[PDB]
Write a structure and sequence with these properties.
The structure is a homodimer. Chain A has 459 residues and is of the alpha/beta class. Chain A has one domain. Chain A is built from 15 helices and 14 strands. Chain A has a six-stranded mixed β-sheet with strand order 7-6-5-8-9-10, sandwiched between helices. Chain A has a four-stranded parallel β-sheet with strand order 2-1-4-3. Chain A is globular. Chain A starts with 33 loop residues before the first helix and ends with a strand. Chains A and B meet through α11, α13 and β7 of A and α11, α13 and β7 of B. The structure holds chloride ion. The site of chloride ion has 4 residues of chain A, from α7. Chain B: Belongs to the glycosyltransferase 37 family. Chain B: Homodimer. Interacts with MUR3, XLT2, XXT2 and XXT5.
Chain lengths: 459, 445
């Protein structure tokens, strides 16, 4: 009575439950509820992953299977770490990400190192730090992405930096230069020699080294597109160039059951009956504690001038829910008051909701996910919290420009160029001519960010 | 049924007071039906009011009587104390008018006509601003010469043209003589009564011979006094009604069930207090009002949505409930949302919040709080009462069901008019008992 055959729960591998083929089927459902449920809470993305990307991800998983932690190839590769140089090609190459910086930085920078692994046929290993395995499920079918806790160099991670004799930028400075491993300082404070990571010739050298250790707090994807060789491959992986983090972030990052219960209970209690949901991600960079009136004006001005929220009259509708995230409750409270106190000019019903005000990282992650479930999103300038949320949702946000001198900016916001995050500390260096250059004005699809003019983003 | 089983008269202008009839779309129908005798009493009141009300010829002529056996008698309610007290003590004075065939006139204070529509079809209930004793209202107290207690004391007791009745909580044994039958017979001849009170004094009227027989006919269900008279008298203005409908629509209208938690803490420190948070979780859980949460990884196998409407000056109690229902799954699978309208348009919002609490299915209230008495009475809700803590210790048991939906009278007289001696007026008849929350109060049951 063998009837998988005639009635297989056969799955379209490009179903919306698998995000159009981005995700593999076959994971254990129970141990990561969020993985295949993103569909019950979100709308399907209009941005479809390319067949080339899908095959690249299926084949990465093959590589991760063969070379992943605890495999015999992994244990054999570890032995190269014992000597300073190697006697021939191992079968497996690695890039290890050190858990460093805030949660927004870690999501974006881990997405960047993963793209890099894809571009260099390396296996990604993840330093779990204090919490990575409490926040996120396993993303690679059949294997773990976590660095083993007995990895020999883990106790060096914290102290690795620019003057470490293994730092690639250190070696370049002191004109010293196959190595068994190499540390890449890619933290935002890195310098000219560290930035040589983004040169074609240096990547040829680095490509030979079996183990790379990366410390980074930046979304450095953009500058990868200005590297000969990588450019052709990226062009094929992402026909729509500003979908990099939308695809890789959705592929890599799935909240654990503990975090996902925060998302689903909040959505089901507070958000699920609205016809439309507006996200307002508020971040105020300022030592003083808010809330600030000029920021409240900025928010009112932005959402009303863009027709996101109705004006009120101080003198069968649709129901719109507003999800506000912020350290200070004051902005949400002010919106909540206004729409309680006065009728809307349009007749629309407006509800205002904020999850939390100042399990901390699990709530932060839940709130990024909740924002990613909204229909239209307003973000804060310079906020990686917003970049994560906009990217997971495929949302081209409206950006609340950074105020100067506590004056409401005019315009208070404007539409982003694309949904992509911003790379805050890009190199400005022409590798071929060996000279300074404006990397925001080389190619049409790499521009300076709307919100931090030094930075670069994909458009 | 917009007319609440005959309690309300048809024919008001709808658009000028949307709440009057449009509130049928926001509450369940009340199971308590006004007696036929009450309905007649109210229609005939409205006739009396049309005939004697402000701006009539009969009013102008009665005014002249104050300058020193006519056909119009009145009782004037002075706007005094907080909103809760005002609503309850106004309902009490209206009952008194019904019992003594008087016209009720309302001193509008700073805000009464900003908060409430006109209750009496085709006349106004507001005292005219040019009423001649208005400037005296503030000063009137137990030392006024026309204070009834001040006359029982000096023994100064023709028919007087007017009398002031001191019925504030600080009144004394001579003031309290108002609640005796013989004093009522004297007071009953005076054409103008002025009352200042902050108490719900209804239950003691049931202990006065003569009033007792009438009250029995008006309210065969004795504990419906405030529920019927309060829904008859108090209709939020369009301004206030918009606070109600907007909040209801945005936050409460999709729930299968609504729980009101009316939090008032009588303390110097603003709080919040963990002993009060513990009282609330314990009360709502032990009474099956809200579900328990739990810490099990393995979950058991659609869910009802409950909205919890919390009112309090401080946001901390609602924030504590909201966090707990965010951070942990419910043991029942039920979906819990927690909502608080405001934290420290003040009186407008106060009235709307009382009105929203009256919209819930089950209600928790705070001991001693007239804010909660108004909510429960308008809603026809018999509450669970969070008892008043002592020494910042969570009461045990944390709460109990009220005996009835009626408010409590905080400052009753304790006096046998006939034997001319003190007595416990909470032990005379079975329908007037000591309150659950304040042991020397009285309430109807
Ligand atoms: Cl180069």
């Amino acid at each position: 009575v063998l009837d998988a055959g005639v009635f297989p729960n056969v799955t379209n591998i490009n179903s919306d439950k698998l995000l159009g083929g981005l995700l593999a089927s076959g994971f254990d459902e129970d141990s990561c509820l969020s993985r295949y449920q993103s569909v019950h809470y979100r709308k399907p993305s209009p941005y479809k992953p390319s067949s080339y990307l899908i095959s690249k991800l299926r084949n990465y998983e093959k590589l991760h299977k063969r070379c992943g932690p605890g495999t015999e190839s992994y244990k054999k590769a570890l032995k190269q770490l014992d000597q300073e140089h190697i006697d021939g090609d191992g079968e497996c190459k690695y890039v290890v990400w050190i858990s460093f910086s805030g949660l927004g930085n870690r999501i974006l920078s881990l997405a960047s190192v993963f793209l890099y692994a894809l571009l260099t046929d390396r296996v990604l290993l993840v330093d779990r730090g204090k919490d990575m395995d409490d926040l996120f499920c396993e993303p690679f079918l059949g294997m773990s992405w976590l660095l083993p806790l007995d990895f020999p160099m883990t106790d060096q991670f914290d102290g690795l930096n620019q003057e470490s004799s293994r730092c690639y930028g250190y070696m370049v400075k002191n004109q010293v230069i196959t190595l068994s491993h190499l540390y890449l300082h890619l933290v935002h404070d890195y310098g000219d020699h560290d930035k040589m990571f983004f040169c074609e010739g240096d990547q040829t050298f680095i490509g030979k080294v079996p183990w790379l250790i990366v410390k980074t707090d930046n979304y450095f994807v953009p500058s990868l597109w200005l590297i000969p060789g990588f450019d052709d491959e990226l062009n094929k992986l992402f026909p729509q160039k500003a979908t990099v983090f939308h695809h890789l972030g959705r592929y890599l990052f799935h909240p654990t059951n503990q975090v996902w219960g925060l998302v689903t209970r909040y959505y089901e209690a507070y958000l699920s009956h609205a016809d439309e949901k507006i996200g307002i991600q508020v971040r105020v960079f300022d030592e003083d504690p808010g809330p600030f009136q000029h920021v409240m004006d900025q928010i009112s001005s932005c959402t009303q001038k863009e027709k996101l929220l109705p004006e009120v009259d101080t003198l069968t509708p649709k129901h719109k829910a507003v999800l506000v995230t912020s350290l200070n409750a004051g902005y949400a409270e002010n919106l909540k008051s206004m729409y309680w106190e006065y009728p809307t000019s349009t007749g629309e019903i407006i509800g205002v909701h904020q999850p939390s005000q100042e399990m901390h990282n699990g709530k932060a992650l839940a709130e990024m996910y909740l924002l990613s479930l909204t229909d239209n999103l307003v973000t804060s300038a310079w906020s990686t919290f917003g970049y994560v949320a906009q990217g997971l949702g495929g949302l081209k946000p409206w950006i609340l420009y950074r105020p100067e001198n506590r004056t409401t900016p005019d315009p208070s916001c404007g539409r982003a160029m694309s949904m992509e995050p911003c790379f805050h500390s890009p190199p400005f260096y022409d590798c071929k001519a060996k000279t300074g250059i404006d990397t925001g004005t080389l190619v049409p699809h790499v521009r300076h960010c709307e919100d931090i003019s030094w930075g670069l983003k994909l458009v």
